[PDB]
Amino acid sequence: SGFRKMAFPSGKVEGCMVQVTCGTTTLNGLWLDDVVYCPRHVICTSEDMLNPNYEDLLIRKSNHNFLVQAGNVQLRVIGHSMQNCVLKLKVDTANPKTPKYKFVRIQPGQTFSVLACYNGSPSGVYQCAMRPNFTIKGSFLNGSCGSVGFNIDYDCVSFCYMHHMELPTGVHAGTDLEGNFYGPFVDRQTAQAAGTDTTITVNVLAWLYAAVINGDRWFLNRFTTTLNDFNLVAMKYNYEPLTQDHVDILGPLSAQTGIAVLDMCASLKELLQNGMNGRTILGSALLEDEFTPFDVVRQCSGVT
Amino acid sequence: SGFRKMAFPSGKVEGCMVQVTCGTTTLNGLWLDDVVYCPRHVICTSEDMLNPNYEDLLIRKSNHNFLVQAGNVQLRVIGHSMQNCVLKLKVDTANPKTPKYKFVRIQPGQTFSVLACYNGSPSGVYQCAMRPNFTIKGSFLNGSCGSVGFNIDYDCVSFCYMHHMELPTGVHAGTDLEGNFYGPFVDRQTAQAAGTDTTITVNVLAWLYAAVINGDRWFLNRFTTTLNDFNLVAMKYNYEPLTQDHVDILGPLSAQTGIAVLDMCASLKELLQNGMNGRTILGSALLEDEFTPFDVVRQCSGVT
Numbered sequence: 297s298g299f300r301k302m303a304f305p306s307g308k309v310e311g312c313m314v315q316v317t318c319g320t321t322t323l324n325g326l327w328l329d330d331v332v333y334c335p336r337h338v339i340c341t342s343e344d345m346l347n348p349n350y351e352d353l354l355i356r357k358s359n360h361n362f363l364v365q366a367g368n369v370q371l372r373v374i375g376h377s378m379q380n381c382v383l384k385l386k387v388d389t390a391n392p393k394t395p396k397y398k399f400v401r402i403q404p405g406q407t408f409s410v411l412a413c414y415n416g417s418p419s420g421v422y423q424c425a426m427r428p429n430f431t432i433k434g435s436f437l438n439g440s441c442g443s444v445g446f447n448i449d450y451d452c453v454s455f456c457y458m459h460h461m462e463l464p465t466g467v468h469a470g471t472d473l474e475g476n477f478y479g480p481f482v483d484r485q486t487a488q489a490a491g492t493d494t495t496i497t498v499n500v501l502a503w504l505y506a507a508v509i510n511g512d513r514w515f516l517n518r519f520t521t522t523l524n525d526f527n528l529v530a531m532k533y534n535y536e537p538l539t540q541d542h543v544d545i546l547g548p549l550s551a552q553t554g555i556a557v558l559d560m561c562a563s564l565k566e567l568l569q570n571g572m573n574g575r576t577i578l579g580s581a582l583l584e585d586e587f588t589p590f591d592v593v594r595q596c597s598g599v600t
Numbered sequence: 601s602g603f604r605k606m607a608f609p610s611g612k613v614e615g616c617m618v619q620v621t622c623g624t625t626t627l628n629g630l631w632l633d634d635v636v637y638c639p640r641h642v643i644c645t646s647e648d649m650l651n652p653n654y655e656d657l658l659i660r661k662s663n664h665n666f667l668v669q670a671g672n673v674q675l676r677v678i679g680h681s682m683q684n685c686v687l688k689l690k691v692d693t694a695n696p697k698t699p700k701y702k703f704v705r706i707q708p709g710q711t712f713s714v715l716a717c718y719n720g721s722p723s724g725v726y727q728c729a730m731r732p733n734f735t736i737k738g739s740f741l742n743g744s745c746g747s748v749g750f751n752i753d754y755d756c757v758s759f760c761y762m763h764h765m766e767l768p769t770g771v772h773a774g775t776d777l778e779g780n781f782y783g784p785f786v787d788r789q790t791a792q793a794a795g796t797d798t799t800i801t802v803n804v805l806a807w808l809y810a811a812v813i814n815g816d817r818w819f820l821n822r823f824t825t826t827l828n829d830f831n832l833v834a835m836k837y838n839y840e841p842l843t844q845d846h847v848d849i850l851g852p853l854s855a856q857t858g859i860a861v862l863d864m865c866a867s868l869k870e871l872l873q874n875g876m877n878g879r880t881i882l883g884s885a886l887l888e889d890e891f892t893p894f895d896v897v898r899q900c901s902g903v904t
């Protein structure tokens with residue numbers, strides 16, 4: 297029993313982290329096969345970060361201007377190219393520690409582990425979610441750019457995120473491993489609107505199933521609801537609307553506990569209308585939305 | 601900015617995990633140099649777990665009865681011995697992936713990362729604290745025994761915990777890497793008293809400094825207090841008493857924010873007497889005690 301904000305073991309990603317220096321700027325890079333992926337703002341100085349013409353700034357750069365260091369040893373850059381907001385540095389050596397991997401673009405509401413890095417060295421690992429407004433609520437300091445988000449299926453690491461920017465609101469924006477920012481964000485030093493951030497309803501429901509599984513059952517009530525009635529309540533409280541796809545993914549958890557999905561929605565509705573009344577659920581005093589139904593199943597089953 | 605329940609990168613521990621089978625029981629082992637450490641209840645069947653005479657049960661075991669598998673390859677056991685509640689299996693090969701390491705016994709209130717494992721394979725990593733009643737609030741399923749808790753200083757892994765048991769209350773009990781259980785717990789299938797669990801006052805104060813550092817400052821007030829006055833409030837609310845050693849360790853955070861330690865105690869006092877009033881602090885609706893003052897400094901500085 298017990299429920300934790302658990303991250304994937306970070307070892308397979310640790311062996312891919314390198315440090316990339318260009319001019320006076322140093323950030324993290326991701327070494328896979330013979331290619332190092334890093335954010336393209338590595339070619340920038342604070343002066344041109346106000347409105348950078350990346351194509352023009354890259355024209356002044358050569359393969360020898362990109363310094364790629366793996367641990368303590370230097371990699372030789374034999375090629376460079378820009379793909380959207382990331383730079384791809386071809387190196388002359390394939391990373392001996394490249395794991396099985398995929399580059400995936402996650403949907404909002406999905407979760408992932410982040411391996412925070414400074415100077416190509418890892419500092420820590422944590423679990424987080426892609427918010428409905430396409431920001432991540434991370435923990436990142438200057439020099440954390442290039443840190444990646446990922447998921448792991450058995451032996452295959454699915455890279456989903458690469459950190460780029462911190463908004464004035466202390467929230468984080470970044471790209472998939474093809475260089476496309478999640479959301480409206482651009483890699484510029486301008487104030488950018490994050491957008492309204494809703495609560496991920498399917499994840500709070502999944503977390504509520506995990507609470508029942510691990511002993512916390514005070515919030516269970518004698519009521520049921522319909523998808524349309526529940527969605528009226530979700531609208532008022534800035535929760536994402538629940539659809540039949542959401543109910544379908546909550547099938548395994550509904551089957552494990554024997555609480556119908558709509559019966560659990562009625563518990564959610566009453567917790568939203570009445571609050572927790574000073575009580576807790578899995579050691580939290582608020583409704584947690586950063587565990588997907590897959591995460592709860594995996595944590596309560598023990599997938600390695 | 602941002603504050604996360606961050607764990608150490610788990611790679612150095614991943615390369616030490618093995619699977620140990622003895623009879624019909626399989627649990628995790630920790631392979632360091634030529635020795636595999638695992639919980640001694642590996643020699644037990646559910647029948648003798650009611651009151652096992654471990655010395656007598658080990659007499660019926662030989663080096664060939666302990667099956668140690670590293671990934672997919674078998675290790676040859678050339679020696680075995682019992683040290684307190686752990687078994688030390690000498691193997692004929694030194695783990696090529698043994699990192700720099702120490703075996704340390706942590707104090708209650710201190711935190712550590714856990715690499716949860718099933719069948720010698722890692723499932724996830726999470727941050728947790730040794731509770732004042734010597735239990736850990738983990739997330740563990742059957743077969744997680746042998747999973748280790750650790751800290752990392754630059755390149756040296758300090759192993760502090762090895763998981764053994766889950767109490768009827770869903771809380772976890774375990775040992776240091778010398779086989780000594782933290783707390784009164786024995787490795788038997790009997791109901792055991794966890795004890796009163798207080799809140800780690802120095803850690804909530806450190807977390808409150810982290811909140812100020814990362815923008816959350818609503819809880820700051822126009823008051824101060826004394827150590828004796830604050831301790832009266834801590835007593836009422838089951839918080840550990842604050843001592844001058846606690847105030848000394850909160851020096852760096854007091855110096856970083858400019859809020860005197862006793863001034864921050866006065867904020868803690870008012871949050872304890874008045875609650876959060878529906879507000880949050882670092883995305884939490886309760887006072888978090890699982891970040892030490894060292895953890896806050898490291899997270900807000902970027903130690904790798």
Ligand SMILES: O=C(Cc1cccc(Cl)c1)Nc1cncc2ccncc12
Nearest residue numbers: 337436437438460461462483484485601
């Ligand atoms: O914000 C930036 C640099 C940047 C500025 C403008 C556009 C881009 Cl694409 C990148 N990176 C950082 C990441 N995470 C956290 C931070 C904390 C402190 N300072 C900087 C941080």
Ligand SMILES: O=C(Cc1cccc(Cl)c1)Nc1cncc2ccncc12
Nearest residue numbers: 297641740741742764765766787788789
């Ligand atoms: O409780 C036990 C076995 C045990 C029984 C009595 C004494 C000892 Cl030293 C060990 N180990 C488990 C660890 N963590 C979580 C669990 C979850 C489910 N089943 C079992 C768990």
